[PDB]
Design an enzyme around this catalytic site. Structure first.
Site, PDB file in Angstrom:
ATOM      1  N   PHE A   1      10.750  -2.022 -12.581  1.00 43.33           N
ATOM      2  CA  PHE A   1      10.667  -2.820 -11.376  1.00 43.33           C
ATOM      3  C   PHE A   1      12.033  -3.228 -10.817  1.00 43.33           C
ATOM      4  O   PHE A   1      12.938  -3.534 -11.576  1.00 43.33           O
ATOM      5  CB  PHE A   1       9.816  -4.060 -11.703  1.00 43.33           C
TER       6      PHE A   1
ATOM      7  N   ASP B   3      10.319  13.118   0.155  1.00 43.85           N
ATOM      8  CA  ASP B   3       9.950  12.057   1.075  1.00 43.85           C
ATOM      9  C   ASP B   3      10.867  10.853   0.999  1.00 43.85           C
ATOM     10  O   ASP B   3      10.419   9.706   0.966  1.00 43.85           O
ATOM     11  CB  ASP B   3       8.498  11.644   0.843  1.00 43.85           C
TER      12      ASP B   3
ATOM     13  N   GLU C 159       0.855  -1.185   0.000  1.00 39.72           N
ATOM     14  CA  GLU C 159       0.000   0.000   0.000  1.00 39.72           C
ATOM     15  C   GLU C 159       0.892   1.237   0.000  1.00 39.72           C
ATOM     16  O   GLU C 159       1.134   1.844   1.048  1.00 39.72           O
ATOM     17  CB  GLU C 159      -0.902   0.030   1.239  1.00 39.72           C
ATOM     18  N   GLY C 160       1.376   1.599  -1.186  1.00 43.83           N
ATOM     19  CA  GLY C 160       2.251   2.747  -1.340  1.00 43.83           C
ATOM     20  C   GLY C 160       1.796   4.043  -0.694  1.00 43.83           C
ATOM     21  O   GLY C 160       0.681   4.153  -0.171  1.00 43.83           O
ATOM     22  N   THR C 161       2.683   5.033  -0.740  1.00 43.04           N
ATOM     23  CA  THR C 161       2.437   6.353  -0.172  1.00 43.04           C
ATOM     24  C   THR C 161       1.105   6.954  -0.626  1.00 43.04           C
ATOM     25  O   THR C 161       0.470   7.709   0.116  1.00 43.04           O
ATOM     26  CB  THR C 161       3.573   7.323  -0.555  1.00 43.04           C
ATOM     27  N   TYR C 162       0.688   6.616  -1.844  1.00 38.44           N
ATOM     28  CA  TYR C 162      -0.562   7.131  -2.394  1.00 38.44           C
ATOM     29  C   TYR C 162      -1.615   6.041  -2.585  1.00 38.44           C
ATOM     30  O   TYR C 162      -2.795   6.256  -2.303  1.00 38.44           O
ATOM     31  CB  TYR C 162      -0.300   7.824  -3.733  1.00 38.44           C
TER      32      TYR C 162
ATOM     33  N   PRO D 281      14.154   4.791   3.511  1.00 36.70           N
ATOM     34  CA  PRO D 281      14.662   3.498   3.047  1.00 36.70           C
ATOM     35  C   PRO D 281      13.713   2.764   2.108  1.00 36.70           C
ATOM     36  O   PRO D 281      14.140   2.172   1.122  1.00 36.70           O
ATOM     37  CB  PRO D 281      14.905   2.739   4.352  1.00 36.70           C
TER      38      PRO D 281
HETATM   39  N1  LIG Z   1       9.525   0.159  -8.727  1.00 35.68           N
HETATM   40  C1  LIG Z   1       9.334  -0.934  -7.927  1.00 35.68           C
HETATM   41  O1  LIG Z   1       9.802  -2.015  -8.263  1.00 35.68           O
HETATM   42  C2  LIG Z   1       8.594  -0.809  -6.776  1.00 35.68           C
HETATM   43  C3  LIG Z   1       7.570   0.193  -6.724  1.00 35.68           C
HETATM   44  C4  LIG Z   1       6.751   0.375  -5.568  1.00 35.68           C
HETATM   45  N2  LIG Z   1       5.839   1.299  -5.582  1.00 35.68           N
HETATM   46  O2  LIG Z   1       5.320   1.698  -6.718  1.00 35.68           O
HETATM   47  O3  LIG Z   1       5.428   1.887  -4.484  1.00 35.68           O
HETATM   48  C5  LIG Z   1       6.972  -0.489  -4.430  1.00 35.68           C
HETATM   49 CL1  LIG Z   1       6.029  -0.374  -2.997  1.00 35.68          CL
HETATM   50  C6  LIG Z   1       7.994  -1.479  -4.475  1.00 35.68           C
HETATM   51  C7  LIG Z   1       8.819  -1.654  -5.640  1.00 35.68           C
HETATM   52  N3  LIG Z   1       9.754  -2.568  -5.673  1.00 35.68           N
HETATM   53  C8  LIG Z   1      10.354  -3.181  -4.454  1.00 35.68           C
HETATM   54  C9  LIG Z   1       9.663  -4.485  -4.129  1.00 35.68           C
HETATM   55  C10 LIG Z   1       9.443  -5.480  -5.121  1.00 35.68           C
HETATM   56  C11 LIG Z   1       8.793  -6.697  -4.788  1.00 35.68           C
HETATM   57  C12 LIG Z   1       8.381  -6.875  -3.456  1.00 35.68           C
HETATM   58  N4  LIG Z   1       8.577  -5.928  -2.473  1.00 35.68           N
HETATM   59  C13 LIG Z   1       9.211  -4.756  -2.822  1.00 35.68           C
END
Ligand SMILES: NC(=O)c1cc([N+](=O)[O-])c(Cl)cc1NCc1cccnc1
Length: 294
Positions: free
Chosen positions: A78, A123, A12-15, A126
């Protein structure tokens, strides 16, 4: 849409909610962030679209922005893991210094780039730093905060992390500068080194006071204008600055020196990403391979 084949929910991202998805056409695996609303600011659309051209090896690429059905979809390159998970996983042994240094150096390169392009992260934490098996680390969610006011509670009303917030933000400054990102990165640098958050505040005032208790309550000497800041109160307790060797032991003087410049109270004295790259701390920087277990 149907062009994407959901692989799983990342969180559940920031948005909004985030899915790892595969483009059924290109076979590309991407991160899909669905954003929450009365039509979504068309101003945000234009701004977000601009972020698509912001390309740098240390910035997570924003592949596409899709506005449809009052829903806003952001498609990102990703990466399999974020620095929060990595730090938790390296908690027992600690991230080797060479890797901490490589990551800090790459992050500063990313910031120097964004900052030279007038793009602020706002923002950094980590969780927003993604890493891959090649030893690269990338800034994620850069110019989003400016295209969506100020944080408070994600979809599931999750608690906003204040641990990396610059003091000028906490003191109510209305205009953020590139300096807020350097501050957050300094907090992250310290955390990778000590394996504990530098300033784990659980409220805005506790965050500010934790900063004050460690770096000393700021005054007009070290921070001209601080007493005129929006939320500054003459009643703030006055804590003496703690010796810096006590804050991030056993980091060496080069490291402590850089950190101290990244944590200067005065946003104007705080070191820039560009200048930080030239700091003697990076004289022996290398690019180690992290031990990632995916
Ligand atoms: N760009 C990305 O790859 C990515 C984007 C978002 N997000 O759009 O917010 C988030 Cl949370 C995590 C990501 N990858 C890290 C990851 C990958 C698989 C499992 N747990 C963490």
């Amino acid at each position: 849409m149907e062009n994407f084949q959901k692989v799983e929910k990342i969180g559940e991202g920031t948005y909004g909610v985030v899915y790892k998805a595969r483009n059924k056409l290109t076979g590309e695996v991407v991160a899909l962030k669905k954003i929450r609303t009365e039509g979504v600011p068309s101003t945000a659309i234009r701004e977000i679209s601009l972020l698509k051209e912001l390309n740098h090896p240390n910035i997570v690429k924003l592949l596409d922005v899709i506005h449809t059905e009052n829903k806003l979809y952001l498609v990102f390159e990703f990466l399999h893991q974020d620095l929060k998970k990595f730090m938790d996983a390296s908690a027992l042994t600690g991230i080797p210094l060479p890797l901490i240094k490589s990551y800090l150096f790459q992050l500063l390169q990313g910031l120097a780039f964004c900052h030279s392009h007038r793009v602020l992260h706002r923002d950094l934490k980590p969780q927003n730093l993604l890493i891959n098996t090649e030893g690269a680390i990338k800034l994620a969610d850069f110019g989003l905060a400016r295209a969506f006011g100020v944080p408070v509670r994600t979809y599931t009303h999750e608690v906003v992390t204040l641990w990396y917030r610059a003091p000028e933000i906490l003191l109510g400054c209305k205009y953020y500068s590139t300096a807020v990102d350097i501050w957050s990165l300094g907090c992250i640098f310290a955390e990778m080194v000590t394996r504990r958050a530098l300033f784990p505040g659980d409220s805005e005032i506790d965050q500010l006071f934790r900063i004050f208790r460690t770096l000393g309550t700021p005054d007009e000497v070290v921070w001209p204008g601080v007493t005129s800041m929006p939320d500054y109160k003459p009643s703030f307790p006055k804590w003496a600055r703690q010796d810096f060797s006590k804050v991030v032991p056993p980091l060496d003087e080069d490291g402590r020196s850089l950190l101290s410049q990244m944590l200067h109270y005065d946003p104007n004295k705080r070191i820039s990403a560009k200048a930080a790259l030239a700091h003697p701390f990076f004289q022996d920087v290398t690019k180690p391979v992290p031990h990632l277990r995916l």
